[PDB]
Amino acid sequence: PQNDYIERHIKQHGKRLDHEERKRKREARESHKISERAQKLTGWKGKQFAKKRYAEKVSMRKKIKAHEQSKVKDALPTYLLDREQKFSVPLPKVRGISEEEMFKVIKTGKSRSKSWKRMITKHTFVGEGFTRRPVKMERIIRPSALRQKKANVTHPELGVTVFLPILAVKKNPQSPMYTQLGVLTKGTIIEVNVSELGMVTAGGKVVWGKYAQVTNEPDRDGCVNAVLLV
């Protein structure tokens, strides 16, 4: 131990007498083994084998193309080189969300026959001073687990995307009563803290906030994605 003992043993004693023949025969048989596996594997193992074969073939083709290319043979400053980088909304006419969905009837009392309550089962922004009211007064319920604070906004320019706090919701289509509720409901326009991106308009009036539109459905995702409206 305490060293490359296997290497020293090989250099002093060598491999097995049939080791070379065994390795050569296994290498020769590898083609038949691959062919048999391509036809015998089942139970989703065939899917993985086919995917790996596809990846290997693509990699080999790309390597061959690169080798052939080798055999054939914007104006950044010195301190920035060798470094990494109509008024229509991007998503008009979003799918309409029914009023029956997103409002789960919640039943209360020993005899659950006076529900009178509604729960919003979609992500919503509830401001900074939310402070739930008494139980007897609250009708619409938005669980805290569904309350989002920071939204992922992608900059159309520079291809850079940053995680920024949500400021407010301005225009949610489909009965903007939901806008008042603050539901995201992909297709909504929300204010975002653009201060991080350092956008400055003419006149020295640095912009720390701007509009943005959510591009992903938060119902089926654990994150909020939006496209910055430059």
């Binding site: 296997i6 043993h9 090989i10 004693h13 060598g14 491999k15 097995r16 007498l17 049939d18």
Partner: protein, 188 residues
């Protein structure tokens, strides 16, 4: 495309004769005789000049042509074994525990006995197949020579002899003890 007919040529040396039945092939020569039942192959034989035999398959497919080729190869191997014979040399290597090899006899089976392999107390007996003779080499320390007329029998015996000494559960990168086929050649 189901070729109309494909044939191959088998060369029979003057020193041996090969009588063939419907599909049973018998080879006779100085060293001995061999037989093989090829009734499952469905091929035809035909003499031309008493020294060459042509095996042909009419309306045979690619697989049938391959079977014809392997039949020709088997016939050639049998002829070579009958004429020259085959000689297999096997060497056993040990690091600490010497390997004791002896040809014991019980009821005429003539098992090959290997003892003290890697210090194991178990006695390994490898039966000797028909038509193959095993003799310990002389002037080549730690070597055993297997000879016979049939390639299949000698090869299977050598494979079994080397496999019976399998190193189980130990790192093959360190334990080099075992039995290996050092060289394959003809008796002549």
């Amino acid at each position: 495309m189901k070729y109309i007919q494909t044939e191959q040529q088998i060369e029979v040396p003057e020193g041996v004769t090969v009588s063939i039945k419907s599909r049973i092939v018998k080879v006779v020569g100085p060293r001995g005789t061999l037989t093989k039942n090829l009734k499952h192959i469905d091929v035809t034989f035909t003499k031309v000049n008493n020294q060459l035999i042509k095996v042909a398959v009419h309306n045979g497919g690619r697989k049938h042509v391959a079977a014809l080729r392997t039949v020709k190869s088997l016939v050639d191997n049998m002829i070579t074994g009958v004429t020259k014979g085959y000689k297999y040399k096997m060497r056993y290597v040990y690091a600490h525990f010497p390997i004791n090899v002896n040809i014991v006899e019980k009821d005429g089976a003539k098992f090959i006995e290997v003892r003290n392999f890697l210090g194991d107390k178990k006695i390994r007996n490898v039966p000797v197949r028909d038509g193959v003779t095993i003799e310990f080499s002389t002037n080549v320390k730690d070597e055993i020579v297997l000879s016979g007329n049939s390639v299949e029998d000698v090869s299977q015996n050598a494979a079994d002899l080397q496999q019976i000494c399998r190193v189980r559960n130990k790192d093959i990168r360190k334990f080099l003890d075992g039995i290996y086929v050092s060289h394959k050649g003809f008796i002549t």
